[PDB]
Amino acid sequence: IPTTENLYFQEVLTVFHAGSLSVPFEELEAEFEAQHPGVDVQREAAGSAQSVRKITELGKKADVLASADYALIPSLMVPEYADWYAAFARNQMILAYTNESKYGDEINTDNWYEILRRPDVRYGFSNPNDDPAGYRSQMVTQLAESYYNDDMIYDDLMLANTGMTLTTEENGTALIHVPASEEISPNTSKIMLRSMEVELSSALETGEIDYLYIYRSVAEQHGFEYVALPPAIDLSSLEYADNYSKVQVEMVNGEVVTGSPIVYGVTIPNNAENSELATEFVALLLGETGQQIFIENGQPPIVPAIAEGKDSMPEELQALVV
Ligand code: MOO
């Protein structure tokens, strides 16, 4: 029987981070505890949007907040809960699978959506209201329409199988509306939906789902075979930023996220209890040691880190940022 520590957090350093950061932050935890004897790092892994909402709406206090989408910090935390943030890593949306997945040896970059259209094929993605990988899965599928010249890709895979709706904005931008989390109501024969993307890893391993909308790093961390989606739709390239911006996702609470290159962001909240200790953890993260942890885990780091609001940043961190 799990204790409260075994359920919740599965001196004190409280860190709320993204699900895809579970592997590098686990190695960062062990290294930080090795350098600091009496320090117990307590990590809570959740979708980045709900990780932010714990601080901004639930009144929870964290020392370190790390998101899969850096932009959630200035749009939701700044200026009441945050005065600064730093872009530290990059990632890539892929479609993961294993040997057991149906149509495995036959799926490639030019037919992935056609495979997902099949009634026997089941696929997974996380909750877009809570997780970046969840809303990014919708972004990838919608952008695939204009790339492959097929205006029915998003309708067949998402609109006809969930509670998601779509409207066209005045500038031609597509806007995806995500209803209440319980009213998403996915077609069980076609879609499996979790709160965060990494909980769906177990589903792909057993063959409960055939394909999974997830990051490249997570696929390499688990050893899954994957489909390298075109740079124009996979949110991996800085050059295709103008193309990615033509799709937006509105959450149930009215918050709008925009298609952009996947850029991870970190910050130390304004109401942090151990801000001194948090500084040292972020220093290890943005320093050479943190950089090598990401490279070894298949996640490319932004070296040097790009920060905003440097006049509010602690002095120890200003030597590691741009
Ligand atoms: O915040 Mo995630 O790394 O899209 O579970």
XYZ file of C-alpha atoms and ligand atoms in Angstrom:
327
model
C 0.000 0.000 0.000
C 1.487 3.369 -1.147
C 2.076 6.141 1.424
C 1.359 9.866 0.706
C 5.039 10.270 -0.340
C 4.671 7.259 -2.678
C 1.631 8.920 -4.272
C 2.451 12.643 -4.305
C 6.270 13.091 -4.374
C 7.034 9.840 -6.255
C 16.304 20.589 3.808
C 13.485 20.127 1.240
C 13.688 20.949 -2.486
C 10.202 20.955 -4.056
C 10.328 20.568 -7.861
C 7.296 20.507 -10.176
C 8.309 19.286 -13.618
C 7.039 17.967 -16.945
C 6.460 14.224 -17.511
C 9.072 14.079 -20.310
C 11.615 15.473 -17.846
C 11.199 12.450 -15.505
C 14.388 10.774 -16.777
C 16.887 13.733 -16.887
C 15.580 15.250 -13.607
C 15.915 11.838 -11.898
C 19.643 11.845 -12.767
C 19.811 15.540 -11.795
C 18.184 14.635 -8.451
C 20.820 11.978 -7.635
C 23.698 14.316 -8.580
C 22.282 17.227 -6.540
C 21.752 14.976 -3.478
C 25.353 13.754 -3.861
C 26.684 17.339 -3.712
C 24.330 18.295 -0.854
C 24.259 15.693 2.030
C 21.130 16.739 3.987
C 18.991 17.679 0.976
C 15.982 15.589 -0.081
C 14.750 16.554 -3.563
C 11.014 15.923 -3.896
C 9.734 15.843 -7.489
C 6.128 15.942 -8.714
C 5.739 14.889 -12.339
C 2.625 16.116 -14.157
C 1.609 17.794 -17.424
C 3.328 21.211 -17.611
C 0.051 23.162 -17.727
C -1.249 21.607 -14.491
C 2.292 21.886 -13.017
C 1.996 25.670 -13.522
C -1.655 25.762 -12.316
C -0.618 24.214 -8.942
C 1.348 27.417 -8.272
C -0.902 29.965 -10.047
C -4.327 28.652 -8.956
C -3.985 25.990 -6.226
C -1.623 28.129 -4.101
C 1.077 25.433 -3.928
C 4.692 26.468 -3.366
C 7.557 25.060 -5.430
C 11.257 25.838 -5.504
C 11.758 24.806 -9.154
C 9.194 24.780 -11.990
C 10.221 23.134 -15.264
C 7.891 23.141 -18.282
C 7.835 21.431 -21.701
C 6.566 24.735 -23.100
C 8.575 27.732 -21.849
C 5.775 30.146 -22.896
C 3.466 28.901 -20.124
C 5.680 30.792 -17.653
C 5.208 34.330 -19.054
C 1.576 33.722 -20.095
C 0.462 32.287 -16.720
C 3.053 33.034 -13.985
C 4.569 36.441 -14.913
C 4.562 38.738 -13.013
C 2.853 37.569 -9.761
C 4.553 34.149 -9.463
C 7.595 34.646 -11.731
C 9.992 37.453 -12.626
C 12.240 35.438 -14.961
C 12.569 32.200 -16.994
C 15.206 30.352 -19.021
C 14.928 28.243 -22.179
C 17.133 25.190 -21.588
C 16.151 22.306 -23.908
C 14.523 21.290 -27.202
C 12.498 18.290 -28.378
C 10.655 16.757 -31.355
C 7.135 15.343 -31.782
C 7.137 11.809 -33.203
C 4.753 8.870 -33.530
C 6.142 5.978 -31.450
C 5.540 2.218 -31.857
C 7.004 -1.271 -31.172
C 7.355 -4.581 -33.021
C 3.940 -5.752 -31.695
C 2.077 -2.731 -33.176
C -0.044 -3.528 -36.245
C 1.320 -2.292 -39.621
C 4.738 -1.733 -37.996
C 7.094 -2.660 -40.846
C 4.761 -0.853 -43.293
C 4.428 2.586 -41.595
C 6.564 5.558 -42.693
C 6.560 9.395 -42.972
C 4.325 9.467 -46.086
C 1.393 7.384 -44.739
C 1.297 7.608 -40.905
C -2.138 9.310 -40.844
C -3.552 6.828 -43.397
C -2.511 4.025 -41.006
C -4.192 5.826 -38.061
C -7.420 6.110 -40.125
C -7.795 2.296 -40.071
C -10.604 1.068 -37.685
C -8.384 -1.646 -36.137
C -5.542 0.802 -35.342
C -5.578 2.380 -31.870
C -3.472 5.417 -30.883
C -2.713 7.506 -27.805
C -2.126 11.080 -26.682
C -2.291 12.983 -23.394
C -4.866 15.494 -22.107
C -4.462 18.814 -24.039
C -5.900 20.733 -21.044
C -3.057 19.500 -18.841
C -0.116 18.480 -21.013
C 1.923 20.148 -23.832
C 2.369 16.790 -25.617
C -1.425 16.565 -25.465
C -2.119 19.822 -27.279
C 0.916 19.402 -29.541
C -0.567 16.080 -30.750
C -3.541 18.089 -32.028
C -1.177 20.681 -33.562
C 0.788 17.995 -35.472
C -2.393 16.369 -36.857
C -3.973 19.694 -37.909
C -0.777 20.962 -39.633
C -0.605 17.637 -41.511
C -3.682 18.722 -43.525
C -1.919 21.548 -45.385
C 1.346 19.592 -45.766
C -0.094 16.396 -47.283
C -2.965 18.210 -49.130
C -5.793 16.431 -47.281
C -8.351 18.630 -45.451
C -9.849 15.614 -43.603
C -6.887 14.375 -41.480
C -7.816 16.290 -38.302
C -11.546 15.514 -38.722
C -11.083 11.727 -39.208
C -8.583 11.201 -36.392
C -9.599 13.770 -33.770
C -12.974 15.519 -34.392
C -14.883 12.288 -35.136
C -13.286 10.418 -32.213
C -13.325 13.067 -29.418
C -15.136 16.109 -28.015
C -12.615 18.463 -29.675
C -14.101 21.089 -31.990
C -12.435 23.430 -34.502
C -13.103 26.959 -35.764
C -11.245 29.058 -38.337
C -9.971 32.452 -37.171
C -10.054 35.640 -39.299
C -6.374 35.339 -40.254
C -6.760 31.734 -41.475
C -5.369 30.266 -38.232
C -7.046 27.032 -37.126
C -8.307 27.034 -33.538
C -8.891 23.793 -31.671
C -11.293 23.942 -28.721
C -10.747 21.385 -25.998
C -13.859 20.875 -23.836
C -13.961 19.909 -20.130
C -11.539 17.039 -19.420
C -14.377 14.554 -18.766
C -16.271 15.768 -21.877
C -13.387 14.925 -24.250
C -15.032 11.452 -24.363
C -12.651 9.542 -26.644
C -13.716 6.631 -28.853
C -12.252 3.685 -26.886
C -11.773 1.689 -30.110
C -9.573 4.451 -31.558
C -8.120 6.510 -28.677
C -6.553 6.044 -25.231
C -6.132 9.270 -23.253
C -3.981 9.954 -20.154
C -3.315 13.001 -17.990
C 0.360 13.116 -19.045
C 2.187 11.551 -22.044
C 4.618 9.301 -20.095
C 1.808 7.245 -18.493
C 0.958 6.061 -22.015
C 4.406 4.439 -22.337
C 3.100 1.339 -20.499
C 0.187 1.113 -22.964
C 2.534 1.039 -25.986
C 4.810 -1.583 -24.359
C 1.983 -4.105 -23.859
C 0.373 -3.384 -27.244
C -2.750 -1.836 -25.715
C -2.170 0.966 -28.266
C -0.383 0.704 -31.618
C 0.882 4.293 -31.998
C 1.750 7.138 -29.616
C 2.027 10.915 -30.020
C 5.081 11.615 -27.856
C 8.530 13.285 -27.804
C 11.637 11.885 -29.525
C 13.571 11.892 -26.242
C 10.953 9.688 -24.496
C 10.984 7.237 -27.454
C 14.778 6.964 -27.164
C 14.592 6.734 -23.329
C 12.207 3.766 -23.615
C 13.674 2.233 -26.799
C 10.615 2.570 -29.050
C 10.660 2.580 -32.853
C 9.293 5.843 -34.257
C 8.202 7.780 -37.340
C 10.209 10.935 -38.057
C 7.441 13.411 -38.911
C 8.139 16.239 -41.434
C 9.964 19.294 -39.933
C 7.098 21.488 -41.182
C 4.642 19.857 -38.731
C 6.682 18.164 -35.915
C 7.463 21.365 -33.892
C 11.237 20.657 -33.954
C 12.642 23.366 -36.249
C 13.057 27.107 -35.600
C 12.809 27.821 -39.348
C 9.240 26.442 -39.558
C 7.956 28.682 -36.697
C 5.705 30.674 -39.079
C 4.067 27.452 -40.292
C 3.552 26.102 -36.746
C 1.850 29.372 -35.672
C -1.098 28.646 -38.015
C -2.584 26.222 -35.452
C -3.750 27.130 -31.945
C -5.330 25.194 -29.094
C -7.718 26.736 -26.589
C -8.055 24.994 -23.230
C -11.347 24.731 -21.274
C -10.288 27.648 -19.002
C -9.801 29.967 -22.019
C -5.999 29.749 -22.197
C -4.634 29.653 -25.738
C -1.410 27.901 -26.667
C 0.246 28.473 -30.063
C 2.087 26.012 -32.323
C 5.783 26.775 -31.964
C 9.133 24.935 -31.804
C 9.296 22.760 -28.666
C 11.328 24.728 -26.144
C 11.596 23.693 -22.484
C 11.615 26.420 -19.817
C 12.664 26.617 -16.169
C 12.023 29.163 -13.379
C 12.265 29.652 -9.618
C 8.848 30.884 -8.361
C 8.578 34.192 -6.437
C 7.068 32.443 -3.400
C 9.663 29.634 -3.252
C 10.543 28.445 0.247
C 14.112 27.331 -0.533
C 15.052 29.841 -3.278
C 18.742 29.687 -2.258
C 18.790 25.899 -2.740
C 16.686 26.237 -5.914
C 19.366 28.526 -7.416
C 21.984 25.772 -6.962
C 19.688 23.173 -8.610
C 19.017 25.433 -11.628
C 22.793 26.180 -11.741
C 23.480 22.450 -12.011
C 20.716 22.241 -14.652
C 22.035 25.098 -16.840
C 25.689 24.186 -16.180
C 27.814 21.649 -18.122
C 26.693 18.720 -15.910
C 23.004 19.304 -16.747
C 23.833 19.654 -20.458
C 25.493 16.202 -20.590
C 22.562 14.580 -18.710
C 20.201 15.783 -21.472
C 22.510 14.662 -24.341
C 22.792 11.162 -22.790
C 18.972 11.012 -22.488
C 18.260 11.968 -26.128
C 17.080 15.526 -25.453
C 19.073 18.365 -27.106
C 19.910 21.231 -24.700
C 19.961 24.957 -25.531
C 23.591 25.874 -24.843
C 23.907 28.619 -23.810
C 20.477 28.894 -22.163
C 18.293 31.778 -23.307
C 16.768 33.768 -20.483
C 14.297 36.595 -20.133
C 14.090 39.049 -17.224
C 17.797 38.731 -16.333
C 17.629 41.740 -13.950
C 15.499 39.607 -11.606
C 17.599 36.419 -11.937
C 19.963 35.341 -9.145
C 23.625 36.312 -9.813
C 24.817 32.666 -9.778
C 22.626 31.891 -12.822
C 23.413 35.016 -14.912
C 26.790 33.508 -15.890
C 25.056 30.591 -17.629
C 22.434 32.520 -19.641
C 21.887 34.799 -22.658
O 4.510 18.564 -19.646
Mo 4.613 17.085 -20.787
O 6.634 16.723 -20.815
O 4.021 17.576 -22.491
O 3.914 15.596 -19.500
